[PDB]
Amino acid sequence: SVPI
Amino acid sequence: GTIYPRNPAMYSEEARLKSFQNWPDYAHLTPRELASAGLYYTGIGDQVQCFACGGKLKNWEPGDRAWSEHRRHFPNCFFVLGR
Ligand SMILES: [Zn+2]
């Protein structure tokens, strides 16, 4: 996943 | 207190679980796993947010686990560090  | 959750209502795991009512069908992680890791659905895409630290995660990939992603990206979260 990636952070916003 | 000396810490404060970004979202007090989502303090409850059951409240977090309910937020996944309209979790999309392509999003492979389960609401169970995500809510247990402190995460609730923001209503946009596959984007979730932590009730504690307020961090947001999206674009989940196969092999991702909720806790390990939460700890990798937000290692100083009190929920991560209280686990
Ligand atoms: Zn967090």
Author numbering:
A (entry chain B): 1 to 4
B (entry chain A): 151 to 233
List passages from the publication reporting this PDB structure.
XIAP (X-linked inhibitor of apoptosis) directly inhibits the upstream caspase-9 and the downstream caspase-3 and caspase-7, and therefore controls critical apoptotic checkpoints. The XIAP protein consists of several domains, including three zinc-containing BIR (baculovirus IAP repeat) domains (BIR1, BIR2 and BIR3) and a C-terminal RING domain. The linker region blocks the active sites of these caspases, while the N-terminal regions of the partially processed caspase-3 and caspase-7 bind the BIR2 domain in a peptide-binding groove that accommodates the four N-­terminal residues.
Therefore, the structures of XIAP BIR2 with five different peptides soaked in and bound to the Smac binding groove were also solved: ATAA, AVPI, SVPI, AIAV and AMRV. Replacing the N-terminal alanine with a serine causes a loss of activity for both BIR2 and BIR3, although this is a conservative change. The crystal structures of BIRC1 and BIRC3 and XIAP BIR2–caspase-3 all have an N-terminal serine at the P1 position; the Oγ H atom is within hydrogen-bonding distance of the glutamine at the edge of the pocket. Even with a serine at P1, the P1–P3 residues bind nearly identically. However, the P4 isoleucine is much larger than alanine, and even though Gln197 rotates away from the pocket (in fact, Gln197 has two alternate conformations in this structure), the larger pocket created by this movement is still not large enough to accommodate the isoleucine side chain without a shift in the backbone. The position of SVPI in BIR2 aligns well with most published BIR domain–AVPI structures. Next, AIAV binds identically to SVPI, but with an intermediate position observed for Gln197, which does not have to move as much to accommodate the valine as it does for the isoleucine. This series of structures highlights the flexibility of the protein and the value of having multiple structures for comparison.
